[PDB]
């Protein structure tokens, strides 16, 4: 029983902080994507300008 | 004009051919499986037959399922046919065999009562204004022992009684993977067949509580086992 409960919460916080890892990677990729696409946006805008 | 129609008919025939080839290969696989099921259900039947024979050699052979009632008036016919229809002359052979059996029964003064297993038999007999007492559908592809138990129980309870004096069954015996023969068996009442002596210094059995109670509680189980074997053989035959 002691074995199982300690393993339980060990896996619990393992999961929690690794989920933070994946989701923070996600938000960095989100800012990356916004950057690249808005660059595309107004570099197309100037295309129609000329 | 008919060039469009001819190309369309070629496409239609190609679709039909693809589907039928698929169905043939599927049926090959499924009959492999059905033969497996039949062969694995065989041993229990063999051993219950042995136990029944060694019970009957030392009991009183006056069970209702064993005496031929004087002046039989009606006979129960269980016709085992299929649900899906892409078989060949399967249901056709079943029905011609059952018609021969009906004429045999009527040439001896017995009006047949009809129980069926499957959809095709119900079509064949509802078209001809027959009165089917009870029907059974949806398990001709993979029959289990509970279906056989239900069928055999209703049959023996209609026999022991609106009441019949013998039970026949018409099903397709499977053999050779190329032999599918519609056969009519008489499952009740049983004929008794003194086989042999095969009893010298052999040791006598002991029965608990006695011989006849075991015999009379084992006979309906034997009829149910036979109905189960019939369903399995008819399934393998339908797949062939």
């Amino acid at each position: 029983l002691a074995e199982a409960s300690q393993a339980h919460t060990k896996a619990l916080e393992d999961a929690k902080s690794e989920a933070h890892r994946v989701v923070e990677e996600a938000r960095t990729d989100a800012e990356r994507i916004a950057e690249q696409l808005e660059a595309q946006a107004d570099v197309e805008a100037e295309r129609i300008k000329m | 004009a008919t060039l469009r129609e001819l190309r369309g008919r070629i496409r239609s025939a190609g679709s039909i051919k693809k589907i039928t080839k698929a169905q043939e290969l599927i049926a090959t696989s499924r009959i492999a499986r059905a033969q497996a099921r039949l062969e694995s259900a065989r041993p229990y039947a063999f051993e219950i037959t042995r136990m029944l024979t060694t019970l009957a050699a030392e009991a009183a052979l006056d069970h209702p399922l064993l005496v031929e009632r004087p002046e039989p008036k009606r006979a129960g016919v269980l016709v085992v046919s299929s649900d899906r229809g892409l078989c060949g002359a399967y249901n056709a052979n079943i029905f011609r065999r059952s018609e021969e059996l009906f004429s045999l029964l009527r040439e001896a003064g017995k009006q047949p009562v009809l129980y069926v297993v499957g959809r095709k038999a119900q079509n064949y007999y509802s078209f001809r204004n027959w009165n089917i007492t009870e029907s059974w559908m949806g398990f001709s592809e993979q029959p289990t022992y509970e279906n056989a138990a239900e069928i055999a129980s209703t049959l023996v309870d209609a026999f022991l009684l609106e009441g019949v004096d013998e039970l026949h069954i018409v099903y397709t015996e499977f053999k050779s993977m190329l032999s599918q023969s519609a056969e009519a068996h008489r499952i009740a009442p049983m004929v008794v067949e003194y086989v042999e002596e095969d009893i010298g210094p052999r040791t006598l059995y002991s029965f608990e509580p006695d011989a006849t109670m075991l015999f009379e509680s084992l006979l309906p189980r034997y009829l149910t086992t036979r109905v189960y074997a019939a369903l399995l053989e008819s399934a393998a035959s339908e797949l062939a």
Partner: protein
């Protein structure tokens, strides 16, 4: 010594092996077979259980439905509609099955209980 035991269901061979002793319950009363024994034919009780005892293993408990039993010179043969080993049983499902009103499934549940060591 040992006796050959074979338990065959209606559509499958449930078990087959050798044993040291074999306890079950005929409709007439409980019974225990040993490697040599009188030829015998009997009908197990509706909620019977079959405990096989082997030399080097733990005893194997089986629940049997509608069984028949016969002992001969070769060994024991048990004929069952259905059989379920002990390490295959939900004791709670068997428990709620035991309290049914239908006698057949009630006997099924009682046998499944007897196999797991309850009731």
């Amino acid at each position: 010594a040992e006796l050959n035991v074979e338990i065959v269901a209606v559509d499958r061979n449930i078990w087959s092996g050798t044993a040291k002793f074999l306890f079950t319950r005929t409709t007439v009363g409980e019974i225990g077979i040993l490697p040599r024994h009188i030829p015998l034919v009997a009908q197990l009780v509706d909620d019977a259980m079959v405990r096989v005892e082997r030399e080097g293993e733990k005893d194997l408990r089986i629940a049997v439905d509608g069984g028949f039993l016969s002992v001969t010179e070769e060994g024991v043969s048990i004929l069952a509609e259905s059989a379920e080993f002990e390490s295959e049983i939900d004791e709670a499902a068997a428990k709620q099955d035991s309290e049914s009103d239908d006698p057949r499934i009630a006997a099924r549940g009682r046998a499944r209980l007897r196999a797991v060591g309850a009731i």
